Ligand binder design. Sequence first.
Ligand SMILES: Nc1ncnc2c1ncn2[C@@H]1O[C@H](COP(=O)(O)OP(=O)(O)O)[C@@H](O)[C@H]1O
Ligand SMILES: Nc1ncnc2c1ncn2[C@@H]1O[C@H](COP(=O)(O)OP(=O)(O)O)[C@@H](O)[C@H]1O
Ligand code: BEF
Ligand code: BEF
Ligand SMILES: [Mg+2]
Ligand SMILES: [Mg+2]
Lengths: 417, 417, 49
Amino acid sequence: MNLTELKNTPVSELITLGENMGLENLARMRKQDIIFAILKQHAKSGEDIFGDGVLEILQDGFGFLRSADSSYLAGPDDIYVSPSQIRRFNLRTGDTISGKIRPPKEGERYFALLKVNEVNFDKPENARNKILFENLTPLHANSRLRMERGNGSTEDLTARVLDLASPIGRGQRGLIVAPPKAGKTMLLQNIAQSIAYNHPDCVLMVLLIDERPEEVTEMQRLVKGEVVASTFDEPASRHVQVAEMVIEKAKRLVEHKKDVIILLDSITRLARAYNTVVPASGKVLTGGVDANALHRPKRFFGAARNVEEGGSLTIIATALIDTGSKMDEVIYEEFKGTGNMELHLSRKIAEKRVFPAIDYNRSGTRKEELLTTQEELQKMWILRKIIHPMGEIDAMEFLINKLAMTKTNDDFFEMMK
Amino acid sequence: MNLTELKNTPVSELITLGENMGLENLARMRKQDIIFAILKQHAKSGEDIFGDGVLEILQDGFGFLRSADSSYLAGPDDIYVSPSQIRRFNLRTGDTISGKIRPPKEGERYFALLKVNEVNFDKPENARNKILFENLTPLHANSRLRMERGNGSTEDLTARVLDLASPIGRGQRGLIVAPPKAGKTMLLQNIAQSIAYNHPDCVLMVLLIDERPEEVTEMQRLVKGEVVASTFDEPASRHVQVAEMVIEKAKRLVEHKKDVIILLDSITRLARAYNTVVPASGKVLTGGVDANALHRPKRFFGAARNVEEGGSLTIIATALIDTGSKMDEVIYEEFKGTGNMELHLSRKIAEKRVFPAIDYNRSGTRKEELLTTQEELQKMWILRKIIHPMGEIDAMEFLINKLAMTKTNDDFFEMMK
Amino acid sequence: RWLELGLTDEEKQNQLEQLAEQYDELKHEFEKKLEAKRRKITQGDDLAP
Ligand SMILES: Nc1ncnc2c1ncn2[C@@H]1O[C@H](COP(=O)(O)OP(=O)(O)O)[C@@H](O)[C@H]1O
Ligand SMILES: Nc1ncnc2c1ncn2[C@@H]1O[C@H](COP(=O)(O)OP(=O)(O)O)[C@@H](O)[C@H]1O
Ligand code: BEF
Ligand code: BEF
Ligand SMILES: [Mg+2]
Ligand SMILES: [Mg+2]
């Protein structure tokens, strides 16, 4: 029996199945131990059990295989793995494992793994002959990501603006600078829809840290991807745990020659969690910030790169400004000269209800010559020269108003002449 | 005999009844043990006894049923419940129980429960087949709360301003940012009166933490609701106890498909109580704050949501600023990007005696499109555009002066054109 | 473990409730005797000044 099958089931179907099995009232307790108990029963009377998830190594040597629907949380759903696997197949933190499991025997409460069927959607034999992550040779953005769908709906134009404001490719670092109440949420939503529609081949992951559960719920069932998130009713331990697990999963997946693109919103809340979870090293900055509290966020942001040997990792993290604290400014200043794809969203345009509010003049992308052709980049330069002397609001006014009538971006370039 | 009957009686009537019974002088001691002793007598010679309250589970397995008029406090008024009930009906922390009780026998001092008559105003059979709280599917605000009464008295206009400044619906999170001496007390009072007058179907609860007893007294007998509060002459244990009990009661009640709306003033004092009651975890923030001291307040604030399956939970917590401490700013900064309904009360307008002092420019509500019609929200946008370029004081001056003559809000929208 | 059911409430559930109440009283009395014997055999003895 597969675990992900009972995973994609709602709680009501689990309740109905447990009542069909004729047991103690299972609807009373957690979905976690609901699945645990129904699995224990169906495995008392049932086949080999099958399961899948992502592995995290403990300091005891053993490992835990956890689910992304539980956002990689500790509980009875986890699969225990022995260090003997981590010696035989030499398992690692963040490996996508899928294999056979069994009930725990006398005194045990965690399902034990039997035989690894797929390691990162690949062969264990081929799991040995792999390349290390930092041992790779990074490179600039080589292949551009097509965000324009070509239909021109009410929201798709938003993505089109990006296609002429800051082109993104596999291996690029994107950083969004926006104050609160600027419309970045559905900005990432439309971006994710477009990159999932245009490229169903690259595995797409999003990250929500200290976000409201409403957006988490509406996102985890609207776009494609293992939509993993971290709500604010948990301490910084869980947030940094999601950070570790998904960043290691992306690292292993690009090591397996796959293009991974990670959507984070926001990087400032994650860095604040990093600060409040890391022990104090004596050196305080302005606003209660540790110098070592930015080391791991810098690692998380710089993990993205464009591999020469194969695969790529592109990160798009959003940053908050203009919200008053000391940490927001110190973090945004520390991260300004890090990413090579700035996207500035000025609230001065969002206050006029002109969406998307994009600061085209203060935005840009370095090494953008390796993403578009000569005439494409030339048209981009000419339009930037045309719109730069204009202000902010009127700039986006002209951009959106002229992209409203024409429907393909190259046609917009043509008509702009 | 019902307990709530003797509960709603003043102390003088209890004294008269005890003297009519011909016993030792009962007026000498607590209302608590006054009711205890008169119940012991009337139950020595009387029917089955009846009682009602909210249940809290102890770490011994048993539970205590307490009263909200005593703000869920420990004392002789409590009803002892055995773990056998918590196995049979599987009782829970925060269940509204009402059932039959008896005097305690030899050596016992707590009234024992006999048979549960109503569990959360519902059937115990139907108390099994229920849905778990976090297992629910949250959603955005779907149904808007009508705060306008339509009479236009001296204070009702205050609520009307909210109806055009930040619309609230079932499941929304409201956070009030106001310095001391800004008129938030009767702001919540008028809001509670309006939502109790317009919607007598949803159970309405308020929360006062570290508040003066005068406001507690004047509130517990002016509006409808189980007005539970926590005065500062008790330590943080009692305050966090009220927090637990009423939040669990609201959770169970929305689990029973009921709309619960919780009024808290203020969230900063409750968070300070949480900080001073939680043990230190080593990590200190600016101002003696624990990182884990905000975890449970964040849980309390994020518990509110709009359920898809049925019922809803809306929280309106007030926050204090500009009072000098480190905790107030760190807490308000931590809670800024949490709530989706900001209400800013600037003291700069309250100093001019212009009530209500509402920062309309710095206030707003996300996902406000799911609460009003197209033309309503359009008129809201046009008026926001009209009043935004104005200052603060003059903005509220114009708002209040133009809402003074017209009496219905849509008529105000019409006349504003 | 399933003393509790439901059918023809008006009198059947009344008798079942009377029985459940008697059972709860019996369990409470047994727990009282248990704790009494416990505190009796575990109380601090007096030996000498
Ligand atoms: N493409 C759009 N069309 C219409 N309205 C929009 C569009 N984008 C944003 N909005 C408006 O902006 C608001 C966005 O709210 P929110 O997602 O909280 O903004 P942010 O994510 O920037 O904080 C909504 O109330 C919506 O009415
Ligand atoms: N709607 C109103 N109607 C009449 N008086 C009001 C109103 N709102 C505020 N006030 C005045 O403001 C004062 C409120 O004090 P208080 O409730 O302690 O404010 P805060 O809680 O902000 O310190 C009262 O003396 C009252 O005269
Ligand atoms: F989601 Be908003 F930008 F706070
Ligand atoms: F209640 Be006041 F604002 F001190
Ligand atoms: Mg947003
Ligand atoms: Mg006050």
